[PDB]
Amino acid sequence: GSRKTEIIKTRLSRALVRNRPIPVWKRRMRGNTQQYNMKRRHWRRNKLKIY
Amino acid sequence: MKIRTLELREKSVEELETLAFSLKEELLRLRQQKNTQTLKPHEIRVMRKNIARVLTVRTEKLYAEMYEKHKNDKRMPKDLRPRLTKAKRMALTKRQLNMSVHSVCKRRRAYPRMYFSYSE
Amino acid sequence: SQAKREMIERRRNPRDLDQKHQREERKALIAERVHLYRNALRIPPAVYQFSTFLNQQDMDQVLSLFRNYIPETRAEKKKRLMSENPRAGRKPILIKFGLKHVTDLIERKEARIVIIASDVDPIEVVVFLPTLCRKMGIPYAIVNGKKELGTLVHLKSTSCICLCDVAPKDSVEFKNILAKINAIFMDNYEITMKKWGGGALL
RNA sequence: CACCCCGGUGGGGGAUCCCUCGGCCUGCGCGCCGGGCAAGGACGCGGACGCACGCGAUAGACGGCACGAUCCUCAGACACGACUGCCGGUCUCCGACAGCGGCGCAGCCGCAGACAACCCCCCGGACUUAAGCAUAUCACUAGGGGGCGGAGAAGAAACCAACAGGGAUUCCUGCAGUAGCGGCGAGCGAACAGGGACGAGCCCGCAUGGCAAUCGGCAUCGCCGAGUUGUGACAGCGCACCGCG
RNA sequence: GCGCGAAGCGGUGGUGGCGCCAUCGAAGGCUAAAUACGCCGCAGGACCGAUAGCGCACAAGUACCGCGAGGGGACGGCGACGA
RNA sequence: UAGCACACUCGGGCGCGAGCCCCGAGGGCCGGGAGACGGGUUCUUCCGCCAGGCCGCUCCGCGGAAGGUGAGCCGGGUCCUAAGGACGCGCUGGCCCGCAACCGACAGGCAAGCGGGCACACAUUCCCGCGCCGUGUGCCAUGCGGCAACGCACCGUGCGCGGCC
RNA sequence: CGCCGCCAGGACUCGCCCCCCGUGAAGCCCCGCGCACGCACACACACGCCCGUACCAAUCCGC
RNA sequence: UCCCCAGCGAACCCACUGCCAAGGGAACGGGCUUGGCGCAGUCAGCGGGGAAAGAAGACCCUGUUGAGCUUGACUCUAGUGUGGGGCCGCGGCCCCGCUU
Ligand SMILES: [Mg+2]
Ligand SMILES: [Mg+2]
Ligand SMILES: [Mg+2]
Ligand SMILES: [Mg+2]
Ligand SMILES: [Mg+2]
Ligand SMILES: [Mg+2]
Ligand SMILES: [Mg+2]
Ligand SMILES: [Mg+2]
Ligand SMILES: [Mg+2]
Ligand SMILES: [Mg+2]
Ligand SMILES: [Mg+2]
Ligand SMILES: [Mg+2]
Ligand SMILES: [Mg+2]
Ligand SMILES: [Mg+2]
Ligand SMILES: [Mg+2]
Ligand SMILES: [Mg+2]
Ligand SMILES: [Mg+2]
Ligand SMILES: [Mg+2]
Ligand SMILES: [Mg+2]
Ligand SMILES: [Mg+2]
Ligand SMILES: [Mg+2]
Ligand SMILES: [Mg+2]
Ligand SMILES: [Mg+2]
Ligand SMILES: [Mg+2]
Ligand SMILES: [Mg+2]
Ligand SMILES: [Mg+2]
Ligand SMILES: [Mg+2]
Ligand SMILES: [Mg+2]
Ligand SMILES: [Mg+2]
Ligand SMILES: [Mg+2]
Ligand SMILES: [Mg+2]
Ligand SMILES: [Mg+2]
Ligand SMILES: [Mg+2]
Ligand SMILES: [Mg+2]
Ligand SMILES: [Mg+2]
Ligand SMILES: [Mg+2]
Ligand SMILES: [Mg+2]
Ligand SMILES: [Mg+2]
Ligand SMILES: [Mg+2]
């Protein structure tokens, strides 16, 4: 909330860079059974537990 | 494998220290070209790996050099002792386990092991 | 509280010095509180007989006899054994030392003179040594210093000292020193074995 | 016309059957953590990389050895060794200190933390059974605390016996659901044998006195230290271990 | 645990006392093997065959929930991978 | 079926598509703008949508691709203590307890930054102007005025006594 | 005031006064004096660490 | 608001259900018996009935099922208090000094 410790922001950045779709070149790989990232996180539905 | 290990064995340890610094510089110039322009996909890969290759040969030469420095030392450095296990490093030696008192020595000496065969 | 910090200063109680850095301060305080309690109790004759030790002039006369029979050092022994005859000469006369050895020579009645240290703690290591030396008739003396007895035999300290025979060049010195210490220790046994010290003295 | 029933086709849903790189069970093997920084965590690391998995600033194969031609989504890499395998390096940071302890000790070390199936020590229930219930039972269990090891613990009789005597411990069989304990209620409950597996025995202390003969440390054959309040003893290990069928 | 507190002879004898006779030597120490056992590795099996079998054959202790201690799923299948 | 927007209206625009998106006009209504905790990229730009939004959407806190958070002066730490905690040691069979290093405040105590520009958004942080604070190095003087209230020599360190609600 | 006037309201604030069987922090920094020490403010030069920093009257918590 | 519409779009509940009268029946039937009727199965109202739905009756009883609580219940128990012993000191007459 605009004031955070160093640990809170690093955990918040790690949650942010994680939250992205599957790169589209991975859909052409053989044995890629994943179509969308099921671990996508939306900020309003899913909460992070970064206190 | 752009820098081969065959050439790195000829260099000395401080000569490999300067090479890893020079190769780290070229990796920074490669990471510049990756951000600004295109690159062949494994150029950063290759330069990262031959930094590791120079540093490994540096470590392998340094383990060999430091071993012959402290070979006949009372206490060798902990790097150069074999890392068995904390329990196995603290084990008694086989000489120490075979240590017995004087009565057990005299008895085994005066009554040694006999080699015999029985038949009825 | 400031009154309590003054309270634990007025009493000198070693159990108040409970921290780690106060450890050397504490055991100095224990040593003096023991010493005041040790001498305020009625010391029995078995312990208090070691308070009567030998005079400084008499101690120097006693040990000057013993210095003729000082055992060899380890450096002297080492070159003695590499010599051509290590057992050359007659059997030497040495100070016999150590509690196991000395009480064996006392019970076998072959010690001529026994020196017992005075400062030995636990004192029960040597409390039998006067009364055993009387039951064998061996003349004994109590000398202050386990440390001074240790230097005669090249140790830091040793509790009891004896020698089993005297050279003929020291025989009349030996009978003068036996008569000097028997008037103190051996002949005053039945007086010293009733004498209570400490708080009984007051 | 709606409604209902039967059939056909189409839906709907995922039963059935077939499959199975998964589980479960049993046996065997292994039984190897940690200041040389463990377990666990945090954060980072792929050219395009989210997750998973791998890894640690040497960060998505670094070295040696073996292998020998592919890896692949793109781009590319590749006999100056692809893809692999085995082993070794590197191995961030948090997480084991108000630390504690040993040794004369220029200093060198150890303990802590993990593991919780097995084993050892301490602490220790209640539901339950008694057709209630309080002793009893559950149970000297569960659980908690502490501590090891590859096993542990036990162990060479202050034993069993009553014979014509056996002979460490542990385990099996067996004594035996017995003797016995028990509101003699519910219930609980061993031991010696006999048979067997396996087998193994030893030691400190009161060691010389014509000399501690013993040990620790070192910058080492000499010091310093321990020690007479008493130190003192060597029989077991190791290597090798295929490539075709 | 506490009180008392030994001995040169002592302990014990299914366990009241005492006596006999018999049998051992406590209050110091070590000791393989046979014995027990999870993870893991290996091999098996009259086991189960995707609501079964482990909670998980799948990006499973994951997603997700709980302040917290903790709780905890669901989801397998084209073909000659040549079209 | 229950239920779900029912103070808006008119014209225009982009667009396959418009009651709701944009623009203009008219008519109304009420908060809006800054911090904390909490959220964590929702911010902003570009592109999208036949999915989500209690209708629709060309819109969006949605989907995709990007961009963005710059400090001696703001806040915290490198400072201080409060109530209080305390992993060490004593006391223990274990606690309690005693001493207590250390810790404990993003609203306490508490050095010093404002005006403006720029900008898609962000800046008291960048830029411009004018300041200020602290630290570290160098380079030393050895005092005076006023009856008095006091005025001044832009000087330091230690101790003691005091100094805030 | 010197290098737009007049009137009113106002957060806040000094001191009086009132209130209390309530009396309204601590410590560091700092300052002052006292007593000692020995010297560096100005000036000039140099320098200034880590973390946070977007946004949130539909962005929070009540699924 | 309802009502009607575009779009969106649930839940409760559900053995099966044409409606009455009397009778019989577990003694108050939607179904049985004997009679009386109604049936295009639609819209909106409505609260008579379905002994309407909620919820393994909270009342009452039973249980050798509890818990909260009380005390002159039973058996115990922390706490308080008491006696004796252990807690190694000197002196003097249980008493008095003393300190270590
Ligand atoms: Mg926050
Ligand atoms: Mg929310
Ligand atoms: Mg049909
Ligand atoms: Mg299924
Ligand atoms: Mg198994
Ligand atoms: Mg590590
Ligand atoms: Mg490699
Ligand atoms: Mg441990
Ligand atoms: Mg049960
Ligand atoms: Mg019962
Ligand atoms: Mg029952
Ligand atoms: Mg009952
Ligand atoms: Mg182990
Ligand atoms: Mg053992
Ligand atoms: Mg039992
Ligand atoms: Mg010995
Ligand atoms: Mg073949
Ligand atoms: Mg006997
Ligand atoms: Mg009998
Ligand atoms: Mg024994
Ligand atoms: Mg199936
Ligand atoms: Mg399953
Ligand atoms: Mg809740
Ligand atoms: Mg409707
Ligand atoms: Mg409205
Ligand atoms: Mg705001
Ligand atoms: Mg926006
Ligand atoms: Mg749409
Ligand atoms: Mg710590
Ligand atoms: Mg503050
Ligand atoms: Mg500035
Ligand atoms: Mg803004
Ligand atoms: Mg409608
Ligand atoms: Mg009727
Ligand atoms: Mg009818
Ligand atoms: Mg109707
Ligand atoms: Mg009704
Ligand atoms: Mg009922
Ligand atoms: Mg009954």
CSV table of N, CA and C (backbone and C1' of nucleotides) in Angstrom, one decimal, chain E residues 6-51:
chain,number,residue,atom,x,y,z
E,6,A,P,27.3,-47.6,59.4
E,6,A,O5',28.1,-48.9,59.0
E,6,A,C5',27.7,-49.6,57.9
E,6,A,C4',27.3,-51.0,58.3
E,6,A,C3',28.4,-52.1,58.0
E,6,A,O3',29.2,-52.3,59.2
E,6,A,C1',26.4,-52.7,56.9
E,7,A,P,30.7,-52.4,59.1
E,7,A,O5',31.0,-53.9,58.7
E,7,A,C5',30.4,-55.0,59.5
E,7,A,C4',30.3,-56.2,58.7
E,7,A,C3',31.6,-56.7,58.1
E,7,A,O3',32.4,-57.5,59.0
E,7,A,C1',29.9,-56.7,56.4
E,8,G,P,33.7,-56.9,59.7
E,8,G,O5',34.8,-57.7,59.0
E,8,G,C5',35.1,-59.1,59.4
E,8,G,C4',34.5,-60.1,58.4
E,8,G,C3',35.5,-60.9,57.7
E,8,G,O3',34.9,-62.2,57.3
E,8,G,C1',34.3,-59.6,56.1
E,9,C,P,34.6,-63.3,58.4
E,9,C,O5',33.3,-64.0,57.8
E,9,C,C5',32.0,-63.4,57.9
E,9,C,C4',31.8,-62.5,56.8
E,9,C,C3',30.4,-62.5,56.2
E,9,C,O3',29.4,-61.7,56.9
E,9,C,C1',32.0,-62.5,54.5
E,10,G,P,27.9,-62.1,56.8
E,10,G,O5',27.5,-61.6,55.3
E,10,G,C5',27.4,-60.3,55.0
E,10,G,C4',27.2,-60.1,53.5
E,10,G,C3',26.0,-60.6,52.9
E,10,G,O3',24.9,-59.8,53.1
E,10,G,C1',27.8,-61.2,51.6
E,11,G,P,23.4,-60.5,53.4
E,11,G,O5',22.9,-60.7,51.9
E,11,G,C5',22.8,-59.7,51.0
E,11,G,C4',22.6,-60.2,49.6
E,11,G,C3',21.5,-61.1,49.4
E,11,G,O3',20.2,-60.5,49.3
E,11,G,C1',23.4,-62.0,48.3
E,12,U,P,19.0,-61.1,50.1
E,12,U,O5',18.6,-62.3,49.1
E,12,U,C5',18.2,-62.1,47.8
E,12,U,C4',18.3,-63.4,47.0
E,12,U,C3',17.5,-64.6,47.5
E,12,U,O3',16.1,-64.5,47.2
E,12,U,C1',19.6,-65.3,46.9
E,13,G,P,15.1,-65.0,48.3
E,13,G,O5',14.6,-66.4,47.8
E,13,G,C5',14.6,-66.8,46.5
E,13,G,C4',15.0,-68.2,46.3
E,13,G,C3',14.3,-69.2,47.2
E,13,G,O3',13.0,-69.6,46.8
E,13,G,C1',16.6,-69.7,47.1
E,14,G,P,11.8,-69.2,47.7
E,14,G,O5',11.2,-67.8,47.1
E,14,G,C5',10.7,-67.8,45.8
E,14,G,C4',9.3,-67.4,45.7
E,14,G,C3',8.3,-68.5,45.9
E,14,G,O3',7.1,-67.9,46.6
E,14,G,C1',7.9,-67.4,43.9
E,15,U,P,6.8,-68.3,48.0
E,15,U,O5',7.5,-67.3,48.9
E,15,U,C5',7.2,-65.9,48.8
E,15,U,C4',8.3,-65.0,49.2
E,15,U,C3',8.0,-63.5,49.2
E,15,U,O3',7.7,-63.1,50.6
E,15,U,C1',9.9,-63.9,47.9
E,16,G,P,6.2,-63.3,51.2
E,16,G,O5',6.3,-62.6,52.6
E,16,G,C5',7.5,-62.8,53.4
E,16,G,C4',7.3,-62.4,54.8
E,16,G,C3',8.4,-62.7,55.7
E,16,G,O3',9.3,-61.6,55.7
E,16,G,C1',6.4,-63.6,56.6
E,17,G,P,10.9,-61.9,55.7
E,17,G,O5',11.2,-62.4,57.2
E,17,G,C5',11.0,-61.5,58.3
E,17,G,C4',11.1,-62.2,59.6
E,17,G,C3',12.3,-63.0,59.9
E,17,G,O3',13.4,-62.3,60.3
E,17,G,C1',10.3,-64.2,60.4
E,18,C,P,14.9,-62.7,59.9
E,18,C,O5',15.2,-64.0,60.6
E,18,C,C5',15.3,-64.1,62.0
E,18,C,C4',15.3,-65.5,62.6
E,18,C,C3',16.4,-66.4,62.0
E,18,C,O3',17.6,-66.2,62.7
E,18,C,C1',14.3,-67.5,61.9
E,19,G,P,19.0,-66.5,61.9
E,19,G,O5',19.0,-68.1,61.7
E,19,G,C5',19.2,-69.0,62.8
E,19,G,C4',18.8,-70.4,62.4
E,19,G,C3',19.7,-71.1,61.4
E,19,G,O3',20.9,-71.5,61.9
E,19,G,C1',17.4,-71.7,61.1
E,20,C,P,22.1,-72.0,61.0
E,20,C,O5',21.8,-73.5,60.9
E,20,C,C5',22.3,-74.3,59.8
E,20,C,C4',21.3,-75.2,59.2
E,20,C,C3',21.7,-75.7,57.8
E,20,C,O3',22.6,-76.8,57.9
E,20,C,C1',19.5,-75.0,57.8
E,21,C,P,24.1,-76.6,57.4
E,21,C,O5',24.1,-76.9,55.8
E,21,C,C5',23.7,-78.2,55.4
E,21,C,C4',22.8,-78.2,54.2
E,21,C,C3',23.4,-77.7,52.9
E,21,C,O3',24.1,-78.6,52.2
E,21,C,C1',21.3,-76.6,53.3
E,22,A,P,25.4,-78.1,51.4
E,22,A,O5',24.8,-77.5,50.1
E,22,A,C5',24.0,-78.2,49.2
E,22,A,C4',23.2,-77.4,48.3
E,22,A,C3',24.0,-76.4,47.4
E,22,A,O3',24.6,-77.0,46.3
E,22,A,C1',22.2,-75.3,48.4
E,23,U,P,26.0,-76.5,45.7
E,23,U,O5',25.6,-75.1,45.0
E,23,U,C5',24.7,-75.1,43.9
E,23,U,C4',24.2,-73.7,43.6
E,23,U,C3',25.3,-72.7,43.3
E,23,U,O3',25.7,-72.8,41.9
E,23,U,C1',23.9,-71.8,44.8
E,24,C,P,27.1,-72.1,41.4
E,24,C,O5',26.6,-70.7,41.0
E,24,C,C5',27.5,-69.6,40.9
E,24,C,C4',26.8,-68.3,41.3
E,24,C,C3',27.6,-67.1,41.6
E,24,C,O3',28.0,-66.4,40.4
E,24,C,C1',26.0,-67.4,43.3
E,25,G,P,29.4,-65.6,40.3
E,25,G,O5',29.2,-64.4,41.3
E,25,G,C5',28.5,-63.3,41.0
E,25,G,C4',28.6,-62.2,42.0
E,25,G,C3',30.0,-61.5,42.1
E,25,G,O3',29.7,-60.2,42.5
E,25,G,C1',29.5,-62.6,44.2
E,26,A,P,30.1,-59.0,41.5
E,26,A,O5',28.9,-58.0,41.6
E,26,A,C5',27.7,-58.3,41.0
E,26,A,C4',26.6,-57.4,41.5
E,26,A,C3',27.0,-56.0,41.7
E,26,A,O3',26.8,-55.2,40.5
E,26,A,C1',25.9,-56.8,43.6
E,27,A,P,28.0,-54.2,40.1
E,27,A,O5',27.7,-52.9,40.9
E,27,A,C5',26.4,-52.3,40.9
E,27,A,C4',26.2,-51.5,42.1
E,27,A,C3',27.2,-50.5,42.4
E,27,A,O3',27.1,-49.3,41.7
E,27,A,C1',26.7,-51.7,44.3
E,28,G,P,28.5,-48.4,41.4
E,28,G,O5',29.5,-49.5,40.7
E,28,G,C5',29.4,-49.9,39.4
E,28,G,C4',30.5,-49.3,38.6
E,28,G,C3',30.5,-49.7,37.1
E,28,G,O3',29.7,-48.9,36.4
E,28,G,C1',32.6,-50.2,38.0
E,29,G,P,28.9,-49.5,35.1
E,29,G,O5',30.1,-49.7,34.1
E,29,G,C5',30.7,-48.6,33.5
E,29,G,C4',31.7,-49.0,32.5
E,29,G,C3',31.2,-49.9,31.4
E,29,G,O3',30.6,-49.1,30.4
E,29,G,C1',33.1,-50.9,32.2
E,30,C,P,29.4,-49.9,29.5
E,30,C,O5',30.3,-50.7,28.4
E,30,C,C5',31.2,-50.0,27.5
E,30,C,C4',32.1,-50.9,26.8
E,30,C,C3',31.4,-51.8,25.8
E,30,C,O3',31.2,-51.2,24.6
E,30,C,C1',32.9,-53.1,27.1
E,31,U,P,29.9,-51.5,23.7
E,31,U,O5',30.0,-53.0,23.4
E,31,U,C5',30.7,-53.4,22.3
E,31,U,C4',31.0,-54.9,22.3
E,31,U,C3',29.8,-55.8,21.9
E,31,U,O3',29.6,-55.9,20.6
E,31,U,C1',31.0,-56.7,23.8
E,32,A,P,28.2,-55.5,19.9
E,32,A,O5',28.6,-55.3,18.4
E,32,A,C5',27.8,-56.0,17.4
E,32,A,C4',28.6,-57.1,16.8
E,32,A,C3',27.8,-58.2,16.2
E,32,A,O3',27.3,-57.8,14.9
E,32,A,C1',29.6,-59.1,17.4
E,33,A,P,25.7,-57.6,14.7
E,33,A,O5',25.2,-59.0,14.2
E,33,A,C5',26.0,-59.8,13.4
E,33,A,C4',25.8,-61.2,13.7
E,33,A,C3',24.3,-61.5,14.1
E,33,A,O3',23.5,-61.7,13.0
E,33,A,C1',25.8,-62.6,15.6
E,34,A,P,22.3,-60.7,12.8
E,34,A,O5',21.0,-61.6,13.0
E,34,A,C5',20.9,-62.9,12.4
E,34,A,C4',20.5,-63.9,13.4
E,34,A,C3',19.2,-63.6,14.1
E,34,A,O3',18.1,-64.1,13.4
E,34,A,C1',20.9,-64.4,15.6
E,35,U,P,17.1,-63.0,12.7
E,35,U,O5',16.6,-62.1,13.9
E,35,U,C5',15.8,-62.6,14.9
E,35,U,C4',15.3,-61.5,15.8
E,35,U,C3',14.7,-60.3,15.1
E,35,U,O3',13.3,-60.5,14.8
E,35,U,C1',16.3,-59.5,16.6
E,36,A,P,12.7,-59.9,13.4
E,36,A,O5',12.6,-58.3,13.8
E,36,A,C5',11.7,-57.9,14.8
E,36,A,C4',11.7,-56.4,15.0
E,36,A,C3',11.5,-55.6,13.7
E,36,A,O3',10.1,-55.6,13.4
E,36,A,C1',13.3,-54.7,14.9
E,37,C,P,9.6,-55.6,11.9
E,37,C,O5',10.0,-54.2,11.3
E,37,C,C5',9.3,-53.0,11.9
E,37,C,C4',10.1,-51.8,11.5
E,37,C,C3',10.3,-51.5,10.0
E,37,C,O3',9.1,-51.0,9.4
E,37,C,C1',12.3,-51.2,11.1
E,38,G,P,8.9,-51.3,7.9
E,38,G,O5',8.9,-49.9,7.2
E,38,G,C5',7.8,-49.1,7.3
E,38,G,C4',8.1,-47.6,7.2
E,38,G,C3',8.7,-47.1,5.9
E,38,G,O3',7.6,-46.8,5.0
E,38,G,C1',10.0,-46.3,7.7
E,39,C,P,7.9,-46.9,3.4
E,39,C,O5',8.9,-45.7,3.1
E,39,C,C5',8.4,-44.3,3.2
E,39,C,C4',9.6,-43.4,3.1
E,39,C,C3',10.4,-43.4,1.8
E,39,C,O3',9.8,-42.7,0.8
E,39,C,C1',11.9,-43.3,3.7
E,40,C,P,9.5,-43.4,-0.6
E,40,C,O5',10.9,-43.8,-1.2
E,40,C,C5',11.8,-42.8,-1.5
E,40,C,C4',13.2,-43.3,-1.5
E,40,C,C3',13.4,-44.5,-2.5
E,40,C,O3',13.6,-44.1,-3.9
E,40,C,C1',14.5,-45.0,-0.5
E,41,G,P,12.8,-44.9,-5.0
E,41,G,O5',13.8,-46.1,-5.3
E,41,G,C5',15.1,-45.8,-5.7
E,41,G,C4',16.0,-47.0,-5.6
E,41,G,C3',15.4,-48.3,-6.3
E,41,G,O3',15.6,-48.3,-7.7
E,41,G,C1',16.3,-48.8,-4.1
E,42,C,P,14.5,-48.9,-8.6
E,42,C,O5',14.6,-50.5,-8.3
E,42,C,C5',15.8,-51.2,-8.7
E,42,C,C4',15.9,-52.5,-8.1
E,42,C,C3',14.8,-53.5,-8.5
E,42,C,O3',14.9,-54.0,-9.8
E,42,C,C1',15.1,-53.6,-6.2
E,43,A,P,13.6,-54.1,-10.7
E,43,A,O5',13.0,-55.5,-10.2
E,43,A,C5',13.8,-56.6,-10.2
E,43,A,C4',13.2,-57.7,-9.3
E,43,A,C3',11.7,-58.0,-9.5
E,43,A,O3',11.6,-58.8,-10.6
E,43,A,C1',12.1,-57.8,-7.2
E,44,G,P,10.1,-59.1,-11.2
E,44,G,O5',9.6,-60.4,-10.3
E,44,G,C5',8.3,-60.7,-10.2
E,44,G,C4',7.9,-61.1,-8.9
E,44,G,C3',6.5,-61.1,-8.5
E,44,G,O3',5.8,-62.3,-9.0
E,44,G,C1',7.6,-60.0,-6.8
E,45,G,P,4.5,-62.2,-9.8
E,45,G,O5',3.4,-62.9,-8.8
E,45,G,C5',3.7,-63.4,-7.6
E,45,G,C4',2.7,-62.9,-6.5
E,45,G,C3',1.3,-62.8,-7.0
E,45,G,O3',0.4,-63.3,-6.0
E,45,G,C1',1.9,-60.7,-6.2
E,46,A,P,0.0,-64.9,-5.9
E,46,A,O5',-1.5,-64.9,-6.5
E,46,A,C5',-1.9,-64.3,-7.7
E,46,A,C4',-3.4,-64.3,-7.9
E,46,A,C3',-4.1,-63.4,-6.9
E,46,A,O3',-5.3,-62.9,-7.5
E,46,A,C1',-4.8,-65.7,-6.7
E,47,C,P,-5.2,-61.3,-8.0
E,47,C,O5',-4.9,-60.5,-6.7
E,47,C,C5',-5.8,-60.4,-5.6
E,47,C,C4',-5.7,-59.0,-4.9
E,47,C,C3',-6.3,-57.9,-5.7
E,47,C,O3',-7.7,-57.8,-5.6
E,47,C,C1',-4.2,-57.3,-4.8
E,48,C,P,-8.6,-57.7,-6.9
E,48,C,O5',-8.8,-56.1,-7.1
E,48,C,C5',-8.9,-55.3,-6.0
E,48,C,C4',-8.7,-53.8,-6.4
E,48,C,C3',-9.0,-53.6,-7.8
E,48,C,O3',-10.3,-53.5,-8.1
E,48,C,C1',-7.0,-52.4,-7.1
E,49,G,P,-10.9,-53.9,-9.6
E,49,G,O5',-10.4,-52.8,-10.5
E,49,G,C5',-10.9,-51.5,-10.4
E,49,G,C4',-10.0,-50.5,-11.2
E,49,G,C3',-10.2,-50.5,-12.7
E,49,G,O3',-10.1,-49.2,-13.2
E,49,G,C1',-8.0,-51.0,-12.2
E,50,A,P,-11.4,-48.4,-13.6
E,50,A,O5',-11.1,-47.0,-13.1
E,50,A,C5',-11.4,-46.6,-11.8
E,50,A,C4',-11.1,-45.1,-11.6
E,50,A,C3',-11.8,-44.2,-12.6
E,50,A,O3',-12.2,-43.0,-11.9
E,50,A,C1',-9.5,-43.9,-12.8
E,51,U,P,-13.6,-42.8,-11.3
E,51,U,O5',-13.4,-43.5,-9.9
E,51,U,C5',-12.9,-42.7,-8.8
E,51,U,C4',-13.8,-42.6,-7.6
E,51,U,C3',-14.2,-43.9,-7.0
E,51,U,O3',-14.3,-43.7,-5.6
E,51,U,C1',-16.1,-42.7,-7.6
